[PDB]
Design a binder for these strands. Structure first.
Ligand SMILES: CN[C@@H]1[C@@H](O)[C@@H](O[C@@H]2[C@@H](O)[C@H](O[C@H]3O[C@H](CN)CC[C@H]3N)[C@@H](N)C[C@H]2N)OC[C@]1(C)O
Ligand SMILES: CN[C@@H]1[C@@H](O)[C@@H](O[C@@H]2[C@@H](O)[C@H](O[C@H]3O[C@H](CN)CC[C@H]3N)[C@@H](N)C[C@H]2N)OC[C@]1(C)O
Ligand SMILES: [K+]
Ligand SMILES: [K+]
Ligand SMILES: [K+]
Ligand SMILES: [K+]
Ligand SMILES: [K+]
Ligand SMILES: [K+]
Ligand SMILES: [Mg+2]
Ligand SMILES: [Mg+2]
Ligand SMILES: [Mg+2]
Ligand SMILES: [Mg+2]
Ligand SMILES: [Mg+2]
Ligand SMILES: [Mg+2]
Ligand SMILES: [Mg+2]
Ligand SMILES: [Mg+2]
Ligand SMILES: [Mg+2]
Ligand SMILES: [Mg+2]
Ligand SMILES: [Mg+2]
Ligand SMILES: [Mg+2]
Ligand SMILES: [Mg+2]
Ligand SMILES: [Mg+2]
Lengths: 111, 88, 47, 66, 102
RNA sequence: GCUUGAGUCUCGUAGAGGGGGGUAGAAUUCCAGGUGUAGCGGUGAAAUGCGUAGAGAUCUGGAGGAAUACCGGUGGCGAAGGCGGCCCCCUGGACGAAGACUGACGCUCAGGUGCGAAAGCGUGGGGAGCAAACAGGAUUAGAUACCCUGGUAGUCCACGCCGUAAACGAUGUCGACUUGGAGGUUGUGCCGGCGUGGCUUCCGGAGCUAACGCGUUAAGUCGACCGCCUGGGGAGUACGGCCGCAAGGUUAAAACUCAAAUGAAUUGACGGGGG
């Protein structure tokens, strides 16, 4: 299968899919008992990875290609947790979308 | 810009010889040919302001050379403007 | 950045400059602001 | 360091010469800066144009993910 | 004027390219142009997918010709559904030497 | 008359210079399907918002607009404004090398004319993303804000108008002259060097300057012509003229009022500046 890690600044979503991108299971830092400051940490992403690895216990997946997307805390800790759960991490690939210019981004925050 | 072959014909037509490239008559005839050629460009490309600045320099330079030639020798001036179809 | 293997993944992402690119593209930078930082950094390395 | 194009005395880089051009792209397919490769400015501009033409003809990739 | 012309043909018309090359150069020669170089690179692997395809058949042509008949050739490339992509480029000079591919 | 200023010709060179047309790849959004299941999104923390009518995530296909990562650079080009994927067509300027040619044809320029960022205006298109206004959620004593979720003009295109910006080098144009040092970029000559041009960045000498600084790209030493200033405020306002569809632009006072206003630098003190 393929592990898709959506690592945003606020949250991490881990979706395990087959090799044709059909979803098998998923978990998130926000739905693993972390809100606010706690949701956007490497640990919350580690916990999300484990619970997602738990969510696809029935399919009996051995090998995982890993697809990392976005700038967030749970880039690495999610991948380690899949290795800790005992997947054959065959590939690590960054698929973070980069425009080749693209659209005007939102205005800067004056905080 | 004007081609080598079109330039060389003008130089021959209005010059003393093939190498009289500096004559006021030759210079004016060359500017006139390029000014006339570019009318087609600017008819199509009305907002080509940058290129038009180059055209207006050709117009101004021609005016200055014709003015020089007039007082230097009006007979040469009078023939030149007649041959090229210039009001002045 | 296609790929001890995890350290190799970190390094490939440093070299493509993935996170620097994403951080720079979070918010719009006016051309005046971009020129200003380009000058300030040009001056910096030149010291 | 040092510009190979001045060393060989090449007139142009040539978009067809993929062997050469592949030395001036990263693994991501990105054009490598002149400060890293030591290419001269004039040749870096010719190189960038060659790589862009090659990318258009699908002789090089734009990215590692197509 | 001197032009370098690359075109890519859909890989299920590799057999139509000998015709294409003959017909396109008849246009050049008939309008009193030179063919300076003509190379058929054959089917190559694309660096990225073009319209689902992973391969295409490349032809290179260096040509001296009037502007007018090269304009005719690009419109031929436009509507010919076999021709998936093409580049026409001005060169300063005629090129006759073998390309780095061949 | 002359050829040294200024031009012309020949051959090349670099360039995001301009106008027009075409095309590529990345990404965002939307639409249609597949898989899948309870969250997603957002913040300092939240909430509004979105989601079991199946979101978010992931995959496939499609639509559409706008912008062109890397290259990229005190890099380049342009009178300034400005100009950045790739390809073609039309086109302007600059520079160099050899000679030849014209023979002061030059410089500057009130009035005049043209060009002129962004916003804005008119008509017709277009509209992904962004986003004045606006709406809701927060924050707060209040919060017509900053922050969050949305979002219309607009931003895009064609044609016309507007004519302004800290439109700045806050430095008018042209020419001559006057120690150096270190870079960049772009020609070219002779044998990795040694020459000869153009453009450009930084430091600094004399000199200049209130000082700060400028310093062969002068703010030095001179010449030509133009524009402009004459205490602060009232005021770039009023009235009149001209221009503009409008918004407004432009030209431009007076009464009254104050004894200052101002520049640079110095010592402190202070900072929700740094060490
Ligand atoms: C306004 N029209 C322009 C049109 O003028 C042209 O732009 C050229 C641009 O192609 C050139 O640049 C491009 O092509 C070069 C070779 N010709 C190589 C470098 C490349 N960036 C610039 N040097 C000058 C622009 N005016 O092509 C693009 C365009 C937008 O259509
Ligand atoms: C004032 N500093 C200069 C800097 O401006 C620049 O100077 C070059 C000089 O190197 C070039 O000349 C030199 O390099 C040439 C490279 N093709 C060959 C001939 C050689 N004399 C000149 N043609 C132009 C100057 N602007 O490079 C050298 C330098 C000393 O750093
Ligand atoms: K076609
Ligand atoms: K005058
Ligand atoms: K809108
Ligand atoms: K002092
Ligand atoms: K008025
Ligand atoms: K007064
Ligand atoms: Mg040009
Ligand atoms: Mg506008
Ligand atoms: Mg409008
Ligand atoms: Mg918004
Ligand atoms: Mg907002
Ligand atoms: Mg003003
Ligand atoms: Mg400006
Ligand atoms: Mg400025
Ligand atoms: Mg001013
Ligand atoms: Mg003037
Ligand atoms: Mg310049
Ligand atoms: Mg100095
Ligand atoms: Mg002074
Ligand atoms: Mg007024």
């Amino acid at each position: 299968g393929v592990a898709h890690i959506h690592a945003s600044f606020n949250n991490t979503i881990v979706t395990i899919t087959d090799r044709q991108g059909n979803a098998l299971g998923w978990a998130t830092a926000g739905g693993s008992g972390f809100r606010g400051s706690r949701k956007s940490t490497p640990f919350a992403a580690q916990v999300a990875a484990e619970r997602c690895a738990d969510a696809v216990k029935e399919y009996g997946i051995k090998n995982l290609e890993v697809m990392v997307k976005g700038p967030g805390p749970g880039r690495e800790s999610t991948i380690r947790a899949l290795n800790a759960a005992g997947f054959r991490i065959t590939n690590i690939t960054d698929v973070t979308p980069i425009p080749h210019x693209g659209c005007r981004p939102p205005k800067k925050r004056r905080v | 810009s004007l081609s080598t072959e079109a330039t060389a014909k003008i130089v021959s037509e209005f010059g003393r010889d093939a190498n009289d490239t500096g004559s006021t008559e030759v210079q004016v005839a060359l500017l006139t040919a390029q000014i006339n050629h570019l009318q087609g460009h600017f008819a199509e490309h009305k907002k080509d302001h940058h290129s038009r600045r180059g055209l207006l320099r050709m117009v101004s330079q021609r005016r200055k050379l014709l003015d020089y030639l007039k007082r230097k020798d009006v007979a040469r001036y009078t023939q030149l403007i007649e041959r090229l179809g210039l009001r002045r | 950045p296609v790929i001890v293997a995890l350290r190799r993944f970190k390094r490939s992402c440093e070299k493509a400059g993935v996170l620097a690119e994403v951080r720079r593209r979070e918010f719009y930078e006016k051309p005046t602001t971009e020129r200003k930082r380009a000058k300030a950094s040009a001056v910096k390395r030149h010291a | 360091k040092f510009c190979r194009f001045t060393a060989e005395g090449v007139q142009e880089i040539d978009y067809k010469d993929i062997a050469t051009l592949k030395n001036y792209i990263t693994e991501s397919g990105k054009i490598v800066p002149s400060r890293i490769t030591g290419t001269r400015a004039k040749y870096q501009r010719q190189l960038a144009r060659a790589i862009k033409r090659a990318r258009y003809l699908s002789l090089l990739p734009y990215t590692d993910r197509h | 004027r001197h032009y370098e012309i690359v075109f890519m043909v859909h890989p299920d018309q590799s057999e139509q390219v000998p015709g294409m090359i003959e017909r396109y150069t008849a246009a050049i020669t008939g309008a009193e142009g030179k063919i300076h170089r003509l190379e058929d690179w054959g089917r190559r692997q694309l660096a990225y997918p073009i319209n689902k395809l992973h391969k295409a058949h490349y032809v290179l042509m260096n040509v001296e010709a009037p502007q007018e008949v090269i304009d005719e050739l690009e419109t031929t490339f436009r509507f010919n559904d076999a021709v998936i992509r093409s580049m026409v480029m001005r060169t300063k000079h005629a090129v006759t030497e073998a390309s780095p591919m061949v």
